[PDB]
Structure formats: C-alpha cells, structure tokens
Specification:
The structure is cut from a larger assembly and holds 1 copy of chain A, 3 copies of chain B and 2 copies of chain C.
Chain A lengths: L7 E2 L4 E3 L6 E8 L5 E4 L11 E2 L8 E3 L6 E4 L4 E8 L5 E2 L8 E2 L3 H10 L7
Antiparallel strand pairs in A: 3-5, 3-8, 4-7, 6-8, 9-10
Chain B lengths: L4 H21 L6 H18 L3 H7 L13 H4 L2 E8 L2 E8 L4
Helix pairs in contact in B: 1-2
Chain C lengths: L1 E3 H8 L6 E3 L6 E3 L38 E10 L2 E10 L2 E6 L21 E4 L4 E4 L1 E7 L5 H7 L2 E7 L5 H5 L5 H12 L5 E7 L5 H10 L3 E5 L6 H14 L2 E5 L9 H8 L4 E3 L22 E5 L10 H12 L7 H10 L2 H12 L5 E2 L12 H16 L11 H11 L1 H7 L16 E4 L10 E4 L2 E7 L13 E4 L7 H4 L2 E4 L1 H5 L2 H5 L4 E4 L20 E3 L6 E3 L2 E2 L18
Parallel strand pairs in C: 4-7, 4-8, 9-10, 10-11, 11-12, 11-21, 12-13, 13-14, 14-15, 15-16, 21-22
Antiparallel strand pairs in C: 2-3, 4-5, 5-6, 8-17, 17-18, 18-19, 19-20, 23-24, 24-25
Bound molecules: sulfite ion (SO3) (2 copies) and nickel (II) ion (NI) (4 copies).
The site of one nickel (II) ion has 5 residues of chain C, from strand 9.
C-alpha cells in the first residue's frame, strides 16, 4: 500500500515487435576507424559505405530492434545483427539515394551501391 | 546590483529553501516542492562556496533522506538540476535520485 | 524479439491492459486499446524513428496528408475512451487520432497522419493527455486569474465581469452592449478561450436581447440582480430565439417564489443550473432538486468539492465575509445556517458519483477557485471510490468508468451545455487542438504543457538562462502561443450567431478566432455524457436530508485529501 | 590650457593611446584614433556644450543634417577598429560616425551630425560601445529567453522552434509553412531581431522550399531529423536557389556516412557548421575538421567555451540527461565518451585564437546558454592570452588584435554568414542602430543600455519610484522601445526574398521592420572578418588529438575565470 | 518544483513576515503591512502544520497585540484572510479583528 | 497589505542581503552584488529604525570593509543609493565610497 504517485501497474506478458515479418541474421563489419551507430528504421542497405556486409541482404529491411534503439559498431568490430522487413508500401526515398522507389528494384539498388562504393555488393 | 533575469529568479529558490528549512526544523516531513527547493539551493550555495560539479553530484544525494520527506516524495524526484556560477563560470549540476 | 511490459511502458508509455495511478490518488486507469503497430512506434530524437526516409516522409508537401504537429504515444483520457494513440494536429485542429509516421516503410499509418518536413513533434510517451478544461462559471475579476486556470489545465473560460466592480465580484455578468464590447476588446489580450455572459434581467425583451446582438455568448440570471419569475422568463425567451445558453443562480431568499415557482417560470426550457448544491447560491434549502429534472444541465462550483472536515467552518465564515453578515443579526445567522448545509454538501459528493450532477466549474474569485476545478474533480472521485467502492459498471479492477464519468464533468459536458462542443471539450477529430499533457505523478494537479490551437501556450519549465530547460526553478510560464499576434490564432472568442451575422468582430477589430455558439436549446440532461440521470430528488425542508429512490444520501467528511500537501508549497 | 590625460579620460572618456581593462580580465584595449577636436568635445547637461546657439544648432530642421540621436564620446570596439567617436543615428540607422555638434561654432563637425532641436543625447563618455550581438543558434523554447539575451548584449536571434516541443527542444527548427507563419506572428511580440529556420530535411525539393516561401530565413539540417546525404543535398539546392543560409548539425552516429561523406554531399556549397567542435553534435570524433574548409562558416556553441576544470564532468552528465542515456547501456557510455572529448575542447580554444573558428553562438536552451555568448567569448580570449601570450600581430602592448578577432565572432561574422550584414552586425554608417553601451567594469558581463533601432529597449536601471533612476534595486528592465507599437519599429524580422516578394508580411499582418536575407551563397571562410584561416585539421581517430601544420593543439583547463564570481549573485 | 502562480506570490508573504519579525525583534512597533504580513504567514504556516480552520481563526487573534503595533494599526485591520493547503486541500481562513 | 510596486521590488533587496549575510557568515569574501545588497538593505532598515539621512550617510561607510569583499569590489562601488520611508517620508540616501 505505499503510494508512488503516477506509478504504473503493467499487465503480464511481453510485447512482440515486428510480429509476422520475416527475420534475417547477417554479419556486419565496421571497416572504418570511427564508430558507426545504426538506428532501428534506416533502410539497411543504405548505411555507411564502410560497413561491410552482403548489401543485397539489407534491401527492403531494417534492424529488428525496438523502435528508437540502435546497434553500435566500434572501429573494426564485426558482429551479427537481426533484420526485419520494411512494411507499408515498401518504398524508400532519400537517405543515401540508393532506392528512391520500390525496394523490389534490387538490381538498380545494387548497381548504385556498387558505383558509389558501398561495401559488400556481391 | 545589476540583477539579470536568472539572478532574480534564483533568489526565489533560496527563499523557498529557507521556508522549507523552517518547516523541517519544526518537525514536518517535507513535501515535493520543499525537498526540491532545499536540494536546489544547496547546489547553488555549493557552487558559490567553490565546490566542484563532481563534489556536488555526490553531496546532493545526502542532503535529505527518506525519513525527511513524505511518502512517495523520494520516488517523485528522479533528478534535480541547477545551474550556478562556479569559480570557472556557469555549470550545470544534476543530482541523480537524490533521496533514496 | 519480445520486450517485457515494464520496459515497453518505460520507453513508449503503457499499452493495452496496463494501469496508471492518477497522481497520489487510489484511482487507476487502464489502457483500453492501442492504435500502434508494435515495433513501428513513433519517437523523436538522435537515432530515433522520425527521421527523413524513415519514420518521417521526405516526399509529401504539407497539403499532402502531412501534419503540423504529432503528439507521439499519448495516453488519452476522454469521455470517448481511455486508450493509447498518436494525435495529429493541422491548421490548429485535431485531424487524426491513430498512428503517425511514414507509409513508405511503416505498417498501420493513419493516412492523414504523415510525419513530413512540415511536422513538429511533441513526445507524449508516459504522459496522460486530456482535453482542455471548460470552465463555465468564471467571474472576470482579476486578469491574474488566467494563468491560475492554465496551470491546472483549463483552456476555456465562460462567464462575465468587468474587473473588480461589485456587480462582477458577485455575478458572472458583463452588462449591456458597451461593457460587452469593452470586454470583447480586453479578451484580445487574454491567452485562453472566452465567452461572455450578459445580464439575464429585465421585464422587456429588448434590453436583454441587445446584449446578445452586441456579442454576448449567453446570459446569467443571478439573484443579486433579481432572480424573479419575469427575469427568468424574459431571459429564456431571448435564449430560445438566439440559440445561447442561460445560467441561473436562483432566489436563495425565496422572496418571489420557492423552487417550484422558478421551475414554473422556466416552463421546461433548457437551463444551466450553477452551484446546484446551493452553498454557492439558490433557493434555500432545496435548490439541488433541480438536478433531477430533464431540462436542467446541472453544475457544481468547487469549494464544496469534496466534503471535508474543514468545509463547513470555512463556508459559514466565507459566507459571512462575502455578505457582510453579522453574528448578532439573528436573521444573518439564520440565513447562513439555511444556506451552508452538511446534509446537501455530503449528498452532492454522491450525486456526482451517480451521474446526477453533470458538470464541475470554478466560480472563480466570487465563491470558488480558478485553478482547482480539475483538482477537485479527481479528489471527489477518489473520495467516492474509498467510501462507496468501485462502481458496479467497472471491470478488470480498473477505475475507467469513474474516470470517464468524472473527466466528462469538466471537458465535454460544459461544452455541450454552452453550445461550443463542435469546437472544444474533447479529444476528437475535427475539434480545436486544446490539449493538456500531464505527468501521471502530477495528474490533475499541475499541467506539464497546455496546447492551445496547436501551439503550446503554458508550460512548467525551468531556468531560461540554462543550457537545457529542466534546471530550476521549474514554474508555470506563458509560452510562444501567448506572444505577439499568435495569441489571436491560438484562442477563440465564442459569440452569439446574431453578433457574428451583424459583423461585431469587424466593428470591434477582433482578431481572435471567432467561435459560434449553437445548438443550446435542443438539449437536456440526457445529452450529458456519462452523467445523464434524471430522478426525483427530495430535500427535507426540516432536516435537509436528501433522498433519491427512497434512500438517504449521506457520506462522511474526510480529514485528508490526495492532490494536496504532497504537491503545494502553500 | 592643457588637461592631464587622467582628468581628460575621466571627463570625456579615453583618447588616443589610452588603454582600458575589459571587466576583470587581463585584456586591454587601446584607443587607435579619435575623431574629436580637443576643446570642442560634445557633452550634455547644465552649463554643458549641447545647448541652443552653442553646441546645439538652433536653425536647422530635422531634414537639414540634424540627428535624431547623438551618442557622445563613445569608445567603439568593432571589427572595423577600436577608436573614439561620436555616433549619430537618424531614422533608426547609424548615419554618422565622427564628430557631432554645431558647425556654427565648432571645428571638425561631421556635416550630417548636427545636434539640433530634433536631437536626443546619450552620454557615452567612459563607456565601451559595441554592435549588438548576433546569435545564430537560438532554440525558441521559452520566451523568457529574450531578456536573458538582451541582458548580455544580444540583439538578433536566428534559429527555430515553436516553444517546448521536443522537436524544438532538440533542433533549431520551425517546421513547415504553418508553424513558420505562427512563429512569425509570435515574433511581433518579441523585443529582439529574429530570423526563423525551417527544417532542412526531405528528399524532394517542394516540402523544403515551401518553408522558404512561407517566410523562413534559412534552414537547419539536424541529425535528429536525419542528417543524411539526401537531406543535406536537397537543403543546399534549395538554399542556392533561395539565397538563404543552411546550418548543419551532422550525423554524430556516422550512420549514413563519415565526415567525408557529409562533405561530399555538401559538394563545395556554402554551409554554416554549428558547434563545430562537436560536443554539441556532429560526426564523432572528427567533425571539427570542417573548420579547415573554405566553403564552411564555422561556429562554436558556448558551453565548451572556454575549457575549464568542470567542463568535462558537466558535459558528460548533461549529455546523459539530454539523451536519457543510461550508465549501464555500454553503447550509451561509449557514445558519450566518443562525443565529449577534452582533446577537441582544448583545441577549440586555440582554434578560436588562431582565427580558424569564426563565430560564437549560444545553442540557447538545447545545449547552451542564452545569455553567455558575449561573456564566454571574452573569457576565451583572456584564457588564450594567459596561456599563449599576446599574439604576434599585437603592438604597443595592447590586446587590440585579439579584441578585434574575438568581437567579430559574435557581431559581424554571424551576420555575414546569415546574409544580414547589410542591416546588422557592426557599427558602420548605413546599418541599423543596434548598439550596446557597456561600463568597462561590466564589459561583456552585464549591458548598461541596449539600443534597438535607435531607441533603448533594455537597460540596467533602478527603483522606478525614486527621485532619480540610480537607486536600488538596479536590475535589467525592458524600456520604452519594447512597449506598444514601438516594438514594431525597433526590431527586424529577417525573411527570405521569395516570401517578401510573395507578400507574406501583408498576408500575416506583420508590422515589424522586414529585413531581406541575401548574399549567403557567394561567400566563404575568406569572408569571415579576422577569422579567415583555412588549413588541414587532422583529428586522430584513436587518440582524438588535433593537429594543424603538424603540431598538436593542446592547452590546459583553467580552475577560475574572470567575468564570473565577482559579478553574479548565483 | 512546479511552482504555480499562487505559490510564487505567497512566497512574498513569507518574506515580508520574516522582514517584519526582524523589525519586531529589534524593538520596533510594527506598522500596517508588517502586521498583516506576520498574521498572514502565521495562518499559512499553520495550515502547513495541519491545524484546522477553526484553530487558526482562534489563534490568529493572539499573534500580535496592540502594544506590538503603532497607534491606529489595530483599528485599521478589520480582518485578515488567507488561503492555504490544509491536509484536506485549500481552505480560506479569516481572522476577525486580529489585534484588539 | 496593499503592496505598491516599490514595496514588492524592495523585498528582493532584503532577500538578497539575507543571502549575502549567510554567505559572509560562512566565511566567504563577498562579491559585487552581495556587497551592494547588504549596504542597501542596511540603509533601508536604518530608515525604518528612524535614523536620519546624515546618520546613514556616515554609517553606510562602515558596514563592509575591504577584507569582507573580493579583490576589486571596493573600487567597483562608487556609491550606493536607496530610497526608503523615514519618519518624515521617503528620502534618498547616497553612501559615497562605502568600502575603502
Ligand atoms: O458568484 S456566486 O453567486 O456563484
Ligand atoms: O540543439 S543542439 O543539437 O545544437
Ligand atoms: Ni452564484
Ligand atoms: Ni458565481
Ligand atoms: Ni546541434
Ligand atoms: Ni542546437
């Protein structure tokens, strides 16, 4: 019966994020010499050129982490991350200008990524 | 005196702390704004005394204890923040979870 | 990947089934539903979701389904529900309640709640968001009263007065065309919505009606101007023609009639009965019986709310002071004893809990506290839970039914009574964005931010010289919405249809948004949300005992209240 | 008849070769030249020179070379010189710097500086007079911030925000046409010059450009809205078309790029790099390397200024508080350690002294102090003199070179960066009369009088009930320039050319003077007065060591500053 | 602290009462605003202590006597009114004819 | 109380002087606004005590000495001026060069 003003009494259970969407694990390496931190909702293929990973596996995807959180890569660090699928219309505009339309245009995305030196186009 | 706007405002905090200290001295358990006022004035006076920001982050956690305040007050105060003129100019002090 | 509920609530605010304590009361509200898509919650900051190409759309111009403002992750408490949603504002109005963000990449985005280049963000995670309070019993006596109101979440003041003139110090009245015009001009500088009441007194129509045509929003019948059958009748004939509401403070003295006589003069027409319990005024001792009638929209004023151990002592003396009564004019002592009654005050607590009194109000500066309407509503609800138990209608152990019943008393019900619920009084799409953010620890006590027409008007914020805004002293302060000409676009002057048709705003040079009063005469008790009960209330003339359905309504006064000494410096 | 120099300086202020200590620093400024004719100095009072037929001309009407205002015997400190002159103001603008009085009888009178019937006098003998400060990094969060700024000699606020909304609490952004319109209206009531920045974010041009056409004066790219290559590019394409400046707070997280990527997106276009040292934001750890580039106009924000023994402790915790970081999310600790760096903070002191960082600013209420831009500029200069010695370029033992280098950082350089130096930023003929009088004992600490458009807006003055204005309490107070409609004629709203051409001021009913932003895209580092150095700045990614011309730039933190505990009550 | 408008104002009354108490302590007969300030602050502090409205109506008549104040002061003060937060919320105290 | 504008303002000076006196009591050398506040409040209290303008011109030069204040403070204060209600109405006191 001690009263903490405004306290919560949360229900039981847990919240599943991004439920129903395909998940994919990939390895990613920061080949640069400065830290790179990546937010939950950035189209994954458009992250910093010096992150090395299979760029194709980042198309149409973002990190499967709670909304508003991020994954950190110290210089030289390699680790695995889990991705989820983008939703809505599955279109991306801006950011690094690799997509500017549907995420279904993989060849175009990769071509642009390759030309601009985004590491890991295979 | 050449009082600026912050100097005028901050006189209010000193006053509120003096009020609260009188209330504590006559045996009352202090409430939320009373507790905040006492801790805040302590930080500002400490800056004036020439203490460091790090000293005040530490000391501000020992100015009031739970038995000094009403039920729930400790948990209502997540932190207390104050800016004051140290010997090396204005700095921000944040006392985290001041009352356990 | 799953998140436990404690951590989920810490980050995004509570979700379905989660409960939140209201301040230091024992009232708990429960999230009924949530409009989010888990994992696509909106949030703003470094590395957060509302960033260009991500949760913020980088393609659409403002006109193209983009918001001016998104409140993220709000816990809404409203007559319409207790639920979790994003709230989208555009052109000063609520345009979307749902899920905001970017349809490019997010599932479940409400189609007109796009975060775009044009969009400002307020983080509401962990906050309770309500409509602005609608205070329909305001004496305009001291302009310092406005900030007092804003600080406790009030956004609309309806009433009257010209400052600290005796007429105004007693009555919510701005009398006649000239005083009305003058106070509409003064209103240009008050950072809150306003509607002005004319004097509901006269035996010819024209003197009363000319106030409506001058820009009054309603009328007040007050005993201090003669609450006679004639003044009642004329005022209601005017109101029926003009489509504005009439408030009444009836003949306490029973000089020209008893309650039944006042009801006969009303003749079934719609009326708002002020301070219906009667300590604040009205036919002694039985005025509160008005609240049983279908044509009466009944409100309480706040000093009787709720019944406490100091109430009676305080009120007997307050009345003596107010009326210059003397302790050795036996008629004055008898008058006071007939007016200030524990029997009707205790019953008033229960009548609120039963939904028989529909509204709260202040009586600011005449016999009531400008900044305590919201405060005292919740104190009453907490006392009633303690004394009467969770009501029948509850389930899941929450106090949601009571919370909807009581929030309606100071939001939607006064707005409906006054004919302004098309504009204000609830968090619904198409209404003006008057919104109050509360930290749950301070809920109903001290508002965090008060949004008026989509721009913050008042906030509890700290040192303006500091590196960030949170250092001391944190105090209530007027924000940019009140400054310059923005005060005109963020506030509404409510006026009669006829003054609007006659061009009064242009004649006076009013720059404020102009709101139209309407649909005031075609309503009744049944239209009071969550508080629609009609019943025969019997008040014993000898003992002052109140009975409803043959049962005496009584409860004890309390020695302590929540939302009191834990919070206030004085 | 000769006067000794001590007595001459006491009566008229200092003359050629005389030195004046700046507050309680060890900085001395020396009078370089003097426009007077010795024996014909202007002064005002009983039996003094400015009297009809004498030093005041009794013949000429206002139009006939007569001033509205003469500041007598000012010691000007400006990028243009440190020198003694009378300053003549007419129609709100500086029209003459020279020698005022009456050509009837005085030698050496500048021909358009006649004291006539129309002329008001301010005595500046013994005062230092500077231009009003130009703060280009203002978050509009709490209107109480304006007086804080005025009290430390700031007269122009450029930035963004809508009050204490989270977007505004993080970013200098007023987003979209509607919020822009609303804040231009609010600006009507703020007694200081203003320019508003829109959101520099989007992947299509139209959403960004529509802000410029709505009345924004510039744009802000901030990482919290996605400081991506696309948003950078679109913003600078808009700016190049619209002739407004873009400020940037870059991607600290290096999420879409490292510094080199942001520089590639900029593609040689002009940009103002905010808090270039990076504690306030930007690519970790090397953002400060921006300040070497010819197309970058680099500013510091003020909490790192200068490097002191409490700086790091203060900032590590401030960052944790601001970003809700936790001491046991190792990523949060690493983030903070990557962002708050003694190596780059100490180098920032020296980069200022070398003229490689060109500007100071506040970051008011987001991560900086509204009233300490001028304060901290001088503290930095004093620390650098103590640690680095008088610079090479000095002579006569004065600190004039340093004083011109540092006054430029908060006056002319921000004005040039923003495209407003035609109007404000220096004491020159043809510019708006925004002038700050300082007693030397309070120089850079508390302004004596702040003149806005030729009328005093703010002053340190005493008891309003007293026989004279000097009795206690002497405090900063708004003056007649802020009252009524005079607030419109004494302040400028700076807007884009396109909004001005499109009639936005008339559409919104803006009564303030309207200033045009221009000549923002055709400038570079070379245009920063006294602070025009381009060089390769290397920041070691492992140690954070900063090198310029192969030499590590390092200095110690100081335990005490001047312009601190001698002056402030708190 | 979350100070509202009344809390800010009412700090002034406490301050004025502290001023007046110092004046009384050094032997001065108090004047009209001094007397009002002392009685008003006593009421507000009494509410904070948890006294009842009825207790304070009684006690407020014994805080100052005529020998504490200047000639005419007693007759200038017909009543002193104050609102403060009691344990059961804000209430109005009126002290009638406080100084006989 | 019927406070006028000057009465409200001047309460601030008393408060600032109380603050400064606490600082002095704990051993600090006082700064510019602290020194001004102490001397100003002394003048106003002296008027309240019924001293003459001439007495206060003299006494105000002995309230603080140079060892009470920081380096440079004496030379920053050319004079301190205050108006207060004497027994014969408001008068202006100017203390010239209060701290030698
Ligand atoms: O002003 S009182 O009659 O509700
Ligand atoms: O507001 S801070 O990002 O310069
Ligand atoms: Ni009434
Ligand atoms: Ni009333
Ligand atoms: Ni920034
Ligand atoms: Ni900023």
């Amino acid at each position: 019966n001690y009263i903490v003003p405004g306290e919560y009494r949360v229900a039981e259970g847990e919240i599943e994020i991004n439920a129903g969407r395909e998940k994919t694990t990939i390895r990613v390496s920061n080949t640069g010499d400065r830290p790179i931190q990546v937010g939950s909702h950035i189209h994954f293929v458009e992250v910093n050129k010096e992150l090395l990973f299979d760029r194709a596996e980042g198309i149409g995807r973002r990190l499967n982490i709670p909304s508003g959180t991020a994954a950190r890569f110290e210089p030289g660090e390699e680790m695995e991350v889990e991705l989820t699928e983008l939703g809505g219309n599955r279109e991306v505009f801006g950011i690094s200008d690799l997509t500017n339309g549907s995420v279904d245009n993989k060849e175009l995305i990769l071509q642009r990524a390759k030309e601009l030196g985004y590491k890991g186009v295979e | 005196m050449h009082l600026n706007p912050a100097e005028k405002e901050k006189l209010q905090i000193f006053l509120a702390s003096e009020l609260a200290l009188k209330r504590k001295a006559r045996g009352l358990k202090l409430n939320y704004p009373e507790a905040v006022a006492i801790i805040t004035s302590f930080i500002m006076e400490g800056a004036r005394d020439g203490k460091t920001v790090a000293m005040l982050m530490e000391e501000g956690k020992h100015v009031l204890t739970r038995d000094d305040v009403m039920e729930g007050v400790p948990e209502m105060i997540d932190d207390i923040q104050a800016e004051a003129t140290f010997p090396d100019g204005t700095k921000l002090v944040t006392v985290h979870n001041p009352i356990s | 990947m799953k998140i436990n509920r404690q951590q989920y609530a810490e980050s995004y605010g509570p979700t379905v089934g989660d409960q939140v304590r209201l301040a230091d009361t024992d009232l708990w509200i429960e999230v009924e539903k949530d409009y989010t898509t888990y994992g696509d919650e909106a949030n703003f900051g470094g590395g957060k979701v509302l960033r260009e190409g991500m949760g913020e759309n980088g393609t659409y111009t403002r006109t193209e389904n983009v918001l001016d403002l998104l409140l993220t992750n709000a816990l809404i408490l409203d007559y319409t529900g207790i639920y979790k949603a994003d709230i989208g504002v555009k052109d000063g109005y609520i345009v979307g309640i749902g899920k905001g963000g970017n349809p490019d990449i997010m599932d479940g985005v409400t189609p007109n709640m796009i975060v775009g280049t044009a969009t400002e963000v307020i983080a509401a995670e962990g906050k309770i968001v309500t409509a602005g309070g609608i205070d329909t019993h305001v004496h305009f006596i001291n302009p310092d009263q406005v900030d007092v109101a804003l600080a406790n979440g009030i956004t609309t003041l309806f009433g009257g007065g010209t400052g600290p003139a005796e007429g105004s110090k007693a009555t919510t009245v701005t009398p006649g065309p000239w005083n009305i015009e003058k106070m509409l001009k003064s209103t240009e500088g008050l950072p809150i919505n306003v509607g002005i009441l004319g004097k509901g007194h006269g035996s010819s129509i024209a003197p009363i009606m000319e106030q409506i045509d001058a820009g009054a929003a309603g009328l007040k019948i007050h005993e201090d101007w003669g609450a006679t059958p004639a003044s009642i009748d004329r005022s209601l004939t005017v109101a029926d023609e003009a489509d504005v509401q009439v408030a009444i403070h009836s003949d306490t003295l029973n000089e020209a009639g008893f309650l039944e006589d006042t009801l006969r003069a009303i003749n079934g027409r719609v009326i708002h009965s002020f301070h219906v319990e009667g300590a604040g005024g009205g036919h002694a001792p039985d005025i509160m019986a008005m609240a049983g009638h279908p044509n009466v929209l009944p409100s309480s004023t706040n000093p009787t709310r709720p019944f406490t151990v100091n109430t009676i002592d305080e009120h007997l003396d307050m009345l003596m002071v107010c009326h210059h009564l003397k302790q050795n004019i036996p008629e004055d002592v008898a008058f006071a004893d007939s007016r200030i009654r524990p029997e009707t005050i205790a019953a008033e607590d229960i009548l609120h809990d039963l939904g028989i009194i529909s509204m709260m109000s202040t009586d600011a500066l005449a016999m009531g506290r400008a900044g305590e309407m919201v405060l005292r509503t919740w104190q009453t609800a907490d006392k009633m839970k303690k004394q009467r138990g969770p009501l029948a209608e509850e389930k899941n152990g929450s106090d949601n039914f009571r919370a909807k019943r009581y929030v309606s008393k100071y939001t939607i019900n006064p707005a409906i009574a006054q004919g302004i619920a098309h504009e204000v009084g609830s968090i619904e799409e198409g209404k003006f964005a008057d919104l109050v953010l509360w930290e749950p620890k301070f809920f109903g006590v001290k508002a965090d931010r008060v949004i008026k027409g989509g721009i913050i008007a008042y906030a509890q914020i700290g040192d303006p010289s500091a590196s960030i805004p949170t250092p001391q002293p944190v105090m209530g302060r007027r924000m940019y919405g009140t400054v310059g000409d923005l005060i005109h676009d963020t506030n509404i002057t409510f006026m009669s249809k006829s003054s609007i048709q006659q061009g009064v705003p242009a004649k006076l040079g009013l720059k404020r948004r102009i709101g139209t009063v309407k649909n005031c005469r075609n309503i009744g008790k049944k239209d009071m949300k969550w508080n629609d009960v009609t019943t025969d209330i019997d008040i014993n003339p000898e003992t002052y005992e109140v009975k409803v359905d043959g049962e005496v309504l009584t409860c004890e006064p309390v020695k302590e209240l929540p939302m009191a000494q834990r919070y206030f410096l004085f």
